[PDB]
Ligand binder design. Structure first.
Ligand code: HEM
Ligand SMILES: Cn1cc(C[C@@H]2NC(=O)[C@@H]3CCCN3C2=O)c2ccccc21
Ligand SMILES: Cn1cc(C[C@@H]2NC(=O)[C@@H]3CCCN3C2=O)c2ccccc21
Ligand SMILES: [Zn+2]
Length: 403
C-alpha cells in the first residue's frame, strides 16, 4: 500500500495524491523514494508545513549531506565534494555577502536593466506575424541575463549553454541515465574549478565577484570553495527562474481577464506577482530536512536521522489555507504563500526573483493582445525535471495595443 515518490506530475496539472495526503489525519505521511527506496516523511498541509519548516530540530545541511535518505535518484553533487554552497558561505563567514548581494540594495541596482530587458525582449516580439515561442525568445534570454549579470559574471553563449544543460541534466527524477546525471554535476564542478575566479573578475557587481573578493580566514577563498558557490548559484538561479517565468507566463496567458485588469491597473501588479508565486507550481519534488533529534508533531514520532519533505505546491494549493486554491486570484490578500519556502532557508534570492517576475508581468500587462497560440493541453512538458518547464510557449498577437 506504500506510496512511491515523486508523483510524476510534470505538467501544471498537480497530482491528485496531494489532496489524498492532505485529507489524511497525520501532519506527515510515509512515502518511499522510487529511486533509492528510502523511506521519507511527506507533509502536504499548510499548517503542518509552517510548524515543520519553523522547527530548529530539522536540518537542511544534514539532509543535503552524502548518505542521507533522499528522494532523488542520484546524489546531487560531484562525487566526493560537499556540494553545499549555503553551508560553505556560512562556514566562510560570508552570510552577509549573500544578503548584501541579493538584498534590496542589489535589487535597486539591477531593476532598471531587468525592466529594460524585459521590455526589449517583448517589444522585439511585436514584429512576429504568426506564432512565436515565449520560452525560447523571452524567458531564456531574460533568465540568462539574470544569472550572468547578478550571479556569475559575463558568460559566453557556450558557457551559458553548458551551465543550462548541466542544470537540466542533473536536476531530474528521470529521463537520463545515472551516469549522465552524475556527469552533469562533475562537468559543472570542473567548469567552475577552472573558471570561477575568472568569472568573478569580469566587470559588473555579480554575486560571484562579491564572494571572491570578500575577506575570509587564511588567504583568499579557495578555487574549490568558489566552485562550490558557482554550482549553488546555477542550480538556485537558473532552472528556477526559467521554469517559474515559463509557468507564470502560461498562468497569465490562461487568464486574459487578469492580464486586462493589470493593464488597466498597474498598481495591482505586485499582488499578482505574489499570487503567481502561490498558484504557479514550480517543483516536482519537495524541500527536505533531516531530524537531528527525536521529535513529535501532532502525534507522529519522527526519529533522529529521518528525512521530512514538504511539498510547497501541495501547501500552496491547500484549501484549508486558500479558499478556491486552484483559482488564480491576483487580488488575494493572503495568507502568505510558500513559493519561496519558509523560515531559516526562505529563498535569499526572493527580492531578485520578485524583481524579474514583476518585470515580466508588466511586459505582459502592457500588451493585452498577447495570447497563447494553442490550448493549454496542447503544451508539451519536459518530463522528469525537478523544476517544471514547458518545451515551448507558442504565442501570437491578437492586437498591438500597449501602454
Ligand atoms: C536569482 C534568482 C535566485 C537565487 C540567487 C536564489 C537563491 C537561493 C538559494 C541560495 C537558496 C538556498 C537557501 C538555503 O537553503 O538556505 C534558495 C532556496 C529557495 N529558493 Fe531561491 N533563488 C532564486 C530564485 C528563486 C525562484 C524564482 C524561486 C521560486 C519561484 C525560488 C524558490 C526557492 C525556494 C522555495 C527555496 C527554499 C528551498 C528549501 O527550503 O530548502 N528561488 N534560493
Ligand atoms: C538551491 N539549491 C540548493 C540545493 C542543495 C545542494 N547545495 C549546492 O550547493 C549544490 C550545488 C549542486 C546541487 N546542490 C544541491 O543540491 C538544491 C537542490 C536542488 C535544487 C536547488 C537547490
Ligand atoms: C519549489 N521549490 C522546491 C524546492 C526544493 C527542491 N525541489 C526538488 O524538486 C528537488 C528534488 C530533490 C531536492 N530538491 C529540493 O530540495 C526548491 C528549491 C529551489 C527553488 C524552488 C524550489
Ligand atoms: Zn489600454
Amino acid at each position: 500500500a506504500t506510496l512511491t515518490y515523486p508523483f510524476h506530475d510534470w505538467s501544471q496539472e498537480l497530482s491528485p495524491r496531494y489532496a489524498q495526503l492532505r485529507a489524511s489525519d497525520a501532519p506527515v505521511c510515509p512515502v518511499v523514494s522510487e529511486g533509492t527506496g528510502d523511506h521519507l516523511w511527506l507533509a502536504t498541509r499548510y499548517a503542518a508545513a509552517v510548524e515543520l519548516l519553523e522547527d530548529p530540530r530539522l536540518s537542511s545541511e544534514a539532509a543535503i549531506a552524502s548518505g542521507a535518505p533522499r528522494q532523488e535518484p542520484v546524489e546531487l553533487r560531484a562525487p566526493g565534494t560537499r556540494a553545499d554552497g549555503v553551508a560553505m558561505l556560512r562556514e566562510a563567514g560570508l552570510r552577509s555577502v549573500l544578503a548584501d548581494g541579493l538584498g534590496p540594495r542589489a535589487v535597486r541596482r539591477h531593476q532598471g536593466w531587468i525592466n529594460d530587458l524585459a521590455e526589449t525582449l517583448m517589444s522585439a516580439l511585436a514584429s512576429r506575424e504568426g506564432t512565436f515561442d515565449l520560452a525560447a525568445d523571452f524567458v531564456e534570454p531574460l533568465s540568462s541575463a539574470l544569472v550572468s549579470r547578478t550571479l556569475l559574471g559575463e558568460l559566453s553563449a557556450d558557457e551559458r549553454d553548458l551551465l543550462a544543460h548541466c542544470a537540466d541534466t542533473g536536476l531530474r527524477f528521470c529521463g537520463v541515465t545515472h551516469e549522465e546525471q552524475v556527469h552533469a554535476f562533475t562537468q559543472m564542478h570542473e567548469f567552475f574549478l577552472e573558471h570561477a575566479r575568472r568569472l568573478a573578475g569580469t566587470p559588473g557587481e555579480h554575486l560571484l565577484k562579491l564572494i571572491a573578493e570578500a575577506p575570509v580566514d587564511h588567504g583568499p577563498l579557495s578555487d574549490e570553495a568558489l566552485a562550490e558557490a558557482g554550482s549553488l548559484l546555477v542550480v538556485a538561479g537558473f532552472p528556477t527562474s526559467s521554469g517559474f517565468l515559463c509557468g507564470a507566463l502560461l498562468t497569465l496567458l490562461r487568464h486574459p481577464d487578469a492580464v486586462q485588469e493589470l493593464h488597466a491597473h498597474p498598481e495591482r501588479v505586485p499582488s499578482a506577482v505574489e499570487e503567481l508565486l502561490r498558484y504557479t507550481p514550480l517543483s516536482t519534488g519537495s524541500v527536505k530536512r533531516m531530524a537531528t533529534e527525536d521529535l513529535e508533531i501532532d502525534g507522529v514520532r519522527i526519529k533522529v536521522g529521518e528525512v521530512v519533505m514538504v511539498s510547497l505546491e501541495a501547501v500552496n494549493h491547500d484549501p484549508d489555507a486558500f479558499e478556491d486554491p486552484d483559482v488564480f486570484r491576483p487580488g488575494r490578500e493572503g495568507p502568505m504563500h510558500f513559493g519561496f519556502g519558509r523560515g531559516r532557508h526562505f529563498c535569499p534570492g526572493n527580492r531578485l526573483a520578485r524583481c524579474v517576475i514583476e518585470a515580466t508581468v508588466r511586459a505582459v500587462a502592457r500588451r493585452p493582445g498577447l495570447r497563447l497560440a494553442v490550448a493549454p493541453e496542447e503544451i508539451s512538458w519536459h518530463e522528469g525535471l525537478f523544476f517544471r518547464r514547458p518545451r515551448a510557449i507558442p504565442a501570437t498577437w491578437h492586437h498591438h495595443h500597449h501602454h
